[PDB]
Amino acid sequence: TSRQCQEQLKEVNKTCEALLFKLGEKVKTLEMEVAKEKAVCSKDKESLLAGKRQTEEQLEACGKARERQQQEQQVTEENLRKVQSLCIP
Amino acid sequence: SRQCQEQLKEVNKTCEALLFKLGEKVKTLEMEVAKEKAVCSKDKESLLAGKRQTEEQLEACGKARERQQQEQQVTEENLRKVQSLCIP
């Protein structure tokens, strides 16, 4: 075993070994990111759906109010025509 | 530098083979992150657009029930005015 063979054996895996540690850190970082994105997505979707449900309920109520205001108008209009036709016999 | 080079070769080959196996894990996870972010943002955009259209419908319905009330006031005012000219 030469002294230059020994120096080479000491150095051969250094960058490979240092990369192994860095890849462990990257795996952990990516596993946390997957878990976080999945949790934030579902939370955001729930808020959007809740906001949308509230607007749909308001649209339903407005629509029903619109049907009963067009109902009353038809009655008032006929009463007005009746009074105008029978006015001054 | 005789059997030393064959030693340097086998030790690095073992280390490099482990690095590439672990590297398959990183690549798999990067693709999963990219896929989920694309599906999530696309779905969020559709939900927000759908919400924006229902609000516009609620705004239009509200403006239509404002026109109906104003026209009901017009009919009631005409009825009140014509009643003063006609016997009940």
Residue numbers in the entry:
A (entry chain A): 0 to 88
B (entry chain B): 1 to 88
Report text from the authors:
PLVAP CC1 is 89 amino acids in length and contains five cysteines. PLVAP CC1 contains five cysteines and one methionine, and previous studies have demonstrated that SAD from sulfur-containing residues—sulfur SAD—can be used for experimental phasing and structure determination. For this experiment, we first screened additional crystallization conditions and obtained PLVAP CC1 crystals in the P212121 space group with unit-cell parameters 35.6 Å, 86.2 Å, and 181.6 Å, referred to hereafter as crystal form I. We then collected data at a wavelength of 1.77 Å, using a low-noise and fast readout EIGER X detector, with an exposure time of 0.015 s per 0.2° oscillation. The data collection encompassed a total rotation of 1,800° while continuously advancing the crystal 300 μm. Constraints related to the detector-to-crystal distance and the long wavelength of the X-ray beam limited the resolution of the sulfur SAD data to 2.4 Å. The structure of PLVAP CC1, determined from crystal form I by sulfur SAD, reveals a parallel dimer with five symmetric interchain disulfide bonds (SS-1 by Cys142, SS-2 by Cys153, SS-3 by Cys178, SS-4 by Cys199, and SS-5 by Cys224). The five disulfide bonds were confirmed in the anomalous difference map. The electron density for residues 141 to 145 of crystal form II chain B was not visible. Structure-based analysis by the Socket2 algorithm for both crystal forms shows that most of the PLVAP CC1 dimer exhibits a classical coiled-coil configuration characterized by heptad repeats (abcdefg in Fig. 6A). Among PLVAP CC1 dimers, the average rmsds are 1.15 Å for crystal form I chain A + B vs. chain C + D, 0.89 Å for crystal form I chain A + B vs. crystal form II chain A + B, and 0.84 Å for crystal form I chain C + D vs. crystal form II chain A + B. Conformational differences are greatest at the N terminus.
The microscopic openings across the walls of many capillaries contain a protein mesh that is formed by the extracellular domain (ECD) of plasmalemma vesicle-associated protein (PLVAP). Current evidence suggests that a single transmembrane protein, plasmalemma vesicle-associated protein (PLVAP or PV1), constitutes the diaphragm’s sole structural protein. PLVAP is a type II transmembrane protein of ~60 kDa with an ~390-amino acid C-terminal extracellular domain (ECD), a single transmembrane domain, and a 26-amino acid N-terminal cytoplasmic domain. The three-dimensional structure of PLVAP CC1 presented here shows that it forms a parallel disulfide-bonded dimeric coiled coil.
